[PDB]
Design a protein around this ligand. Sequence first.
Ligand code: LBV
Ligand code: LBV
Ligand code: CL
Ligand code: CL
Ligand code: CL
Ligand code: CL
Lengths: 502, 509
Amino acid sequence: ACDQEPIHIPNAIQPFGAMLIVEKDTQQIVYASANSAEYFSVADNTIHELSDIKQANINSLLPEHLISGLASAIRENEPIWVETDRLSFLGWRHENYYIIEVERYHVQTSNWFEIQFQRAFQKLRNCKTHNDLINTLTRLIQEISGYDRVMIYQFDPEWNGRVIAESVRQLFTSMLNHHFPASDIPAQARAMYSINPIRIIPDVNAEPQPLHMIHKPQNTEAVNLSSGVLRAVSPLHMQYLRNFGVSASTSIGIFNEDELWGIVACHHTKPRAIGRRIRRLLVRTVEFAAERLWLIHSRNVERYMVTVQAAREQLSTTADDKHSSHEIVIEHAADWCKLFRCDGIGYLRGEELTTYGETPDQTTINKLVEWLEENGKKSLFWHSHMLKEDAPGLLPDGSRFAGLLAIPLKSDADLFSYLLLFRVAQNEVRTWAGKPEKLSVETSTGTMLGPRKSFEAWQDEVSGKSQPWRTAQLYAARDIARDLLIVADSMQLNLLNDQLAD
Amino acid sequence: ISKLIAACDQEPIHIPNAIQPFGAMLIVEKDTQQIVYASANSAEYFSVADNTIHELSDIKQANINSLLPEHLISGLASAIRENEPIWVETDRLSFLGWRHENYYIIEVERYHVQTSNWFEIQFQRAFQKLRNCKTHNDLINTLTRLIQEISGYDRVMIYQFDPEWNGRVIAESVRQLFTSMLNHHFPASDIPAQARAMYSINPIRIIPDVNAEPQPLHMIHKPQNTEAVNLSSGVLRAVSPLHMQYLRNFGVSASTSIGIFNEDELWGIVACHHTKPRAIGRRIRRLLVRTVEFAAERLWLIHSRNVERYMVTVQAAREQLSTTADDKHSSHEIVIEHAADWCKLFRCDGIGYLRGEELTTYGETPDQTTINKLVEWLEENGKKSLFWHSHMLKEDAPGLLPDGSRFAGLLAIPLKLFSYLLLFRVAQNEVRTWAGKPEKLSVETSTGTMLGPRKSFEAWQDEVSGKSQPWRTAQLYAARDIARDLLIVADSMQLNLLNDQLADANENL
Ligand SMILES: *C/C=C1/C(=C/c2[nH]c(/C=C3[NH+]=C(/C=C4\NC(=O)C(C=C)=C4C)C(C)=C\3CCC(=O)O)c(CCC(=O)O)c2C)NC(=O)[C@H]1C
Ligand SMILES: *C/C=C1/C(=C/c2[nH]c(/C=C3[NH+]=C(/C=C4\NC(=O)C(C=C)=C4C)C(C)=C\3CCC(=O)O)c(CCC(=O)O)c2C)NC(=O)[C@H]1C
Ligand SMILES: [Cl-]
Ligand SMILES: [Cl-]
Ligand SMILES: [Cl-]
Ligand SMILES: [Cl-]
């Protein structure tokens, strides 16, 4: 019921600007935030109270270019940004309505943004690794935004997440490598980043301004405020931020194409106001950082394939030196352990077994081979990172092996042949920002589904599991294993030809 | 002619001791703080900065601290890394200064105050459009459309280099005034190596007026070192007269180009032309370079993901092969079942699988006799390799193929009683349109005698025959893996047959 709160239609705004909601076909103003008088009086003396906006003509409150744009815009939820000498308007269409946000603005011209943008592009282009990219991005967001704690928060497949990079200044504890549960950001909150990539909360304790009905709309249903920035903040998130020790907040979605991959999360210990040009500078910067990061990852994929091609050219050369596949394994199995990020290797053909590194004993290898022969066929390869779950009754009790990659090399033939790659359990200590308790009621606040009070480090453990096998490794190990098969088959064809000759 | 082209790289374009006239330039010594050079138009710019300036002679007496704003002086002093320009604006002047060895170089332009949200809206629209480009063709065409809309230049082109630094226009947005150059080939000599190198020092080059008289540098106070000062980091550096005449012959009054970098290698340039003079301010310059930079990372990401998608396709094929083989099909049956797919996967016209005396072919292949001449010849010369490949057999393997053979491409995977997978590519003769006939001009310059610019850029065709598309690396390894998949099935069946004949032999014995 965390994802059931209708945060798109709160009928209230944060007080760092005002909002109007107009009907498209009637041009009537049907809603105005309660603070609207103090914004539009900057342009018009006559406006002293909310009811003066009810007497007002939409053509007298809005710039002609805002109205023109809105009239001609084809796309819904595509905000038009229009400035006067004193006000910065952000308007867009949603169904029968124009939604218009307004903030206070004044012209002050410099080359600061262009200089910051050039430096950000230069630093990001010189990142060659994932680590360098992410830490550079946090430093840049912190320079540009002035917030005291800037984090990169990456989602896992369950929408749990982790802080993986961080620039944190002072007054703030370090959240780096802390885990957060999925409840901290419910699905409709994640969804908002696809509508507007930035979310700004200049002041956690600013009181929200409700939307008042001005002229009677044709349809009474709440209006979706999703594309702007003024949308009021769910009280559960406000309190979560208060518990986090946060007074202002800003997050930017990190998108891998359409996929929400992670988030730049920025916190400040005091209220802090950053304008439209800073918000856009931040979003442009995150967009360039994300492209570059996906490019680093994609290039690492090619680079790995080059590494595997090198290992196979090394293997073909040992084989040209007339060595048996048994001898190839003893020669190269340690390089393979790096290539495959595994702890041990068994190569099996018929009665013959060759091992390297951390391996179950020969008995257990034979029981795995038999089990795979009976229950693991019908697969190019069989893998597991939770071996006791996935193939019980096999390992001895208390065994430390948790991962297995198995490449079958024969089928319906005279003997069995496998390449086996083993991973020991890695018993990972996860640090959580407070115990990830499933929500019920928080008795300190008397809140149904309330957030945890404390984000202080809390450690748990998941055992009996290894790294999952990457797709790139599955195929590279199948390729390596089948290189051995070709060697062994060549030698068995020689031997068999001789014996049939006799 | 080779010598005349090589002499193009001789002109030291980094030290012309002159500037384009859309600004002014001062050069100061770092240790002595004295002004050692001033472009000849300095006084019309710095008279805005000091009322006592009325003439170039007045710079000789002037103190630097009254000519440059405090932020620029502090910034240049505190500047550690060379060739990193500092951009400082005043009310009326836009300054740009950097340090090069023992000099500060300062360019100054006239400045028009921008008070709108235009640039930020353009940045948002450009990035939105580039982020939504998911193919190579979409990216490059969207890029030229954005560069033309932002800059207003009448012709924008993406010009990609080949490994020999010739190039081709691969995308274009051109307005009614100019002739289309799409798919036209230009030779390397159009952009000498020194010229290609300048993009690494400043990614943008700006020539607002091809007929603007360049302003020489005047010595103010004597420098310790009389060598000409390197001007490469700025934008005011005067243009080679050979390239100005080139642009005149191209019918161009103004140009701006932005280098396209893939990491540290110059992969091409965005070239923009106008039929009248056209200056672009510092902000438009930055918006251009930032857009080209976001677009390139996008393009490299698109290519890199294409390799990933190609490997997914290859693995889906190899899984299909495995499904067929587990129905106890022979290798020749598998080749007949899947070779039409393999021809797409490998973009080839034909495939042959050879195993001892057996040959299976699909699509266009040489005849059996030629296939045996290939196989036998490969054993002599392809023993040292994992695969062997050529996209011009008649050069890479002279005398091998019969006279008149349609075939130009060969990818051969050895499997052993010989066994091979052979992948064949028909010659696809390729007509190239060049921008102008190759004229062998000679021109006597100051730096020596070198190639003069072409006078005509009209379409001139030539033709490359006897070649196929070149084999991509992803295809070499994919084909090798398919081939060895076929080897493994064939070996399995020979092993089965051998064990049967052996068990029968021992039974009869
Ligand atoms: C039962 C509902 C719950 C809930 C709701 C909720 N949360 C948000 C918004 C955000 N939550 C965030 C969480 C984090 N901030 C961090 O800094 C980190 C990690 C370092 C995490 C995990 C963030 C970032 C947001 C976005 C807003 C922001 O930037 O602060 C919403 C949406 C708020 C709104 O826009 O109205 C909602 C409804 N959170 C829970 O914990 C439970 C109780
Ligand atoms: C013997 C010397 C030669 C020579 C010299 C030269 N050329 C440049 C600069 C450029 N040439 C360019 C060529 C093109 N513009 C296009 O639009 C296309 C194709 C669509 C090509 C090939 C370009 C782009 C430049 C950069 C400058 C610009 O953007 O216009 C220089 C360096 C100029 C300078 O920066 O001082 C020099 C020395 N060109 C030859 O033709 C030979 C004869
Ligand atoms: Cl905004
Ligand atoms: Cl602003
Ligand atoms: Cl500039
Ligand atoms: Cl400007």
